[PDB]
PDB file of C-alpha atoms and ligand atoms in Angstrom:
ATOM      1  CA  UNK A   2      32.302  26.494 -20.101  1.00 26.01           C
ATOM      2  CA  UNK A   3      34.529  26.553 -23.169  1.00 28.52           C
ATOM      3  CA  UNK A   4      36.759  23.658 -23.183  1.00 27.50           C
ATOM      4  CA  UNK A   5      39.026  25.616 -25.547  1.00 27.09           C
ATOM      5  CA  UNK A   6      42.132  23.563 -25.544  1.00 27.15           C
ATOM      6  CA  UNK A   7      40.448  20.061 -25.974  1.00 24.30           C
ATOM      7  CA  UNK A   8      38.347  21.228 -28.901  1.00 22.86           C
ATOM      8  CA  UNK A   9      41.330  22.922 -30.591  1.00 25.70           C
ATOM      9  CA  UNK A  10      43.439  19.762 -30.536  1.00 25.15           C
ATOM     10  CA  UNK A  11      40.576  17.583 -31.672  1.00 27.09           C
ATOM     11  CA  UNK A  12      40.311  19.956 -34.656  1.00 27.33           C
ATOM     12  CA  UNK A  13      43.923  19.700 -35.303  1.00 26.42           C
ATOM     13  CA  UNK A  14      44.160  15.929 -34.736  1.00 29.12           C
ATOM     14  CA  UNK A  15      41.298  15.353 -37.168  1.00 27.50           C
ATOM     15  CA  UNK A  16      43.005  17.729 -39.661  1.00 26.34           C
ATOM     16  CA  UNK A  17      46.377  15.784 -39.500  1.00 27.51           C
ATOM     17  CA  UNK A  18      44.659  12.718 -40.327  1.00 29.34           C
ATOM     18  CA  UNK A  19      42.867  14.268 -43.357  1.00 32.73           C
ATOM     19  CA  UNK A  20      46.181  15.920 -44.553  1.00 30.42           C
ATOM     20  CA  UNK A  21      47.771  12.293 -44.437  1.00 30.50           C
ATOM     21  CA  UNK A  22      44.850  10.859 -46.422  1.00 28.93           C
ATOM     22  CA  UNK A  23      46.646   9.415 -49.573  1.00 30.30           C
ATOM     23  CA  UNK A  24      43.876  10.895 -51.918  1.00 33.91           C
ATOM     24  CA  UNK A  25      43.945  14.254 -50.043  1.00 34.19           C
ATOM     25  CA  UNK A  26      47.543  14.514 -50.226  1.00 37.37           C
ATOM     26  CA  UNK A  27      47.469  14.709 -54.061  1.00 38.35           C
ATOM     27  CA  UNK A  28      44.881  17.530 -54.017  1.00 41.21           C
ATOM     28  CA  UNK A  29      46.034  21.206 -53.924  1.00 40.22           C
ATOM     29  CA  UNK A  30      46.956  23.169 -50.928  1.00 40.97           C
ATOM     30  CA  UNK A  31      44.032  25.784 -51.470  1.00 40.23           C
ATOM     31  CA  UNK A  32      41.582  22.975 -51.701  1.00 39.23           C
ATOM     32  CA  UNK A  33      42.776  21.465 -48.341  1.00 40.87           C
ATOM     33  CA  UNK A  34      42.859  24.995 -46.531  1.00 40.04           C
ATOM     34  CA  UNK A  35      39.306  25.638 -47.627  1.00 37.24           C
ATOM     35  CA  UNK A  36      38.040  22.183 -46.481  1.00 38.31           C
ATOM     36  CA  UNK A  37      39.719  22.761 -43.083  1.00 38.70           C
ATOM     37  CA  UNK A  38      38.320  26.134 -42.623  1.00 36.23           C
ATOM     38  CA  UNK A  39      34.879  24.706 -43.262  1.00 39.20           C
ATOM     39  CA  UNK A  40      35.427  22.433 -40.486  1.00 40.29           C
ATOM     40  CA  UNK A  41      36.025  25.228 -37.895  1.00 40.93           C
ATOM     41  CA  UNK A  42      39.906  25.463 -37.941  1.00 37.97           C
ATOM     42  CA  UNK A  43      41.359  28.913 -37.638  1.00 37.55           C
ATOM     43  CA  UNK A  44      44.401  29.756 -39.973  1.00 37.96           C
ATOM     44  CA  UNK A  45      46.664  29.315 -37.044  1.00 37.74           C
ATOM     45  CA  UNK A  46      45.223  25.622 -36.498  1.00 36.51           C
ATOM     46  CA  UNK A  47      45.593  24.909 -40.142  1.00 36.42           C
ATOM     47  CA  UNK A  48      49.088  26.006 -39.867  1.00 39.86           C
ATOM     48  CA  UNK A  49      49.874  23.644 -36.747  1.00 39.85           C
ATOM     49  CA  UNK A  50      48.096  20.829 -38.959  1.00 41.94           C
ATOM     50  CA  UNK A  51      50.387  21.382 -41.790  1.00 38.44           C
ATOM     51  CA  UNK A  52      53.683  21.481 -39.639  1.00 37.66           C
ATOM     52  CA  UNK A  53      52.648  18.340 -37.914  1.00 39.22           C
ATOM     53  CA  UNK A  54      52.405  16.457 -41.155  1.00 37.02           C
ATOM     54  CA  UNK A  55      55.694  17.540 -42.270  1.00 37.36           C
ATOM     55  CA  UNK A  56      54.558  20.006 -45.112  1.00 40.55           C
ATOM     56  CA  UNK A  57      54.790  23.243 -43.060  1.00 37.91           C
ATOM     57  CA  UNK A  58      52.934  26.437 -44.451  1.00 35.77           C
ATOM     58  CA  UNK A  59      53.395  29.954 -43.624  1.00 35.32           C
ATOM     59  CA  UNK A  60      50.523  31.824 -41.590  1.00 32.51           C
ATOM     60  CA  UNK A  61      50.376  34.273 -44.344  1.00 30.79           C
ATOM     61  CA  UNK A  62      49.926  31.881 -47.154  1.00 32.73           C
ATOM     62  CA  UNK A  63      47.206  30.217 -45.321  1.00 29.76           C
ATOM     63  CA  UNK A  64      45.385  33.514 -44.650  1.00 27.52           C
ATOM     64  CA  UNK A  65      45.876  34.743 -48.192  1.00 23.63           C
ATOM     65  CA  UNK A  66      44.259  31.577 -49.326  1.00 19.96           C
ATOM     66  CA  UNK A  67      41.362  32.291 -47.068  1.00 22.77           C
ATOM     67  CA  UNK A  68      41.010  35.935 -47.537  1.00 26.26           C
TER      68      UNK A  68
HETATM   69  O1  KZ2 B 101      41.985  33.010 -38.404  1.00 23.65           O
HETATM   70  C1  KZ2 B 101      41.696  32.932 -39.699  1.00 23.65           C
HETATM   71  O2  KZ2 B 101      41.205  31.901 -40.267  1.00 23.65           O
HETATM   72  C2  KZ2 B 101      42.235  33.928 -40.561  1.00 23.65           C
HETATM   73  C3  KZ2 B 101      42.003  33.831 -41.995  1.00 23.65           C
HETATM   74  C4  KZ2 B 101      42.364  34.858 -42.994  1.00 23.65           C
HETATM   75  C5  KZ2 B 101      42.814  36.004 -42.447  1.00 23.65           C
HETATM   76  C6  KZ2 B 101      43.100  36.270 -41.153  1.00 23.65           C
HETATM   77  C7  KZ2 B 101      43.536  37.306 -40.304  1.00 23.65           C
HETATM   78  C8  KZ2 B 101      43.524  37.205 -39.226  1.00 23.65           C
HETATM   79  S1  KZ2 B 101      42.969  35.497 -38.554  1.00 23.65           S
HETATM   80  C9  KZ2 B 101      42.688  35.313 -40.191  1.00 23.65           C
END
């Protein structure tokens, strides 16, 4: 029993709040991407979150930060 979809959108929703934090917004992209990876988001979920806050990032640029 996985509940794959619910845990995915919980991670993204928490990520959106994080990325909207007024202090977090003024930190570099690499710092935010590493933070979200440490909370269990995949690169694809990190990409979804950046689009949802209106600062879209490419999948490759996220993967390149994390590789
Ligand atoms: O899913 C990730 O977080 C991820 C991160 C970095 C590289 C690659 C390549 C395939 S997935 C992935």
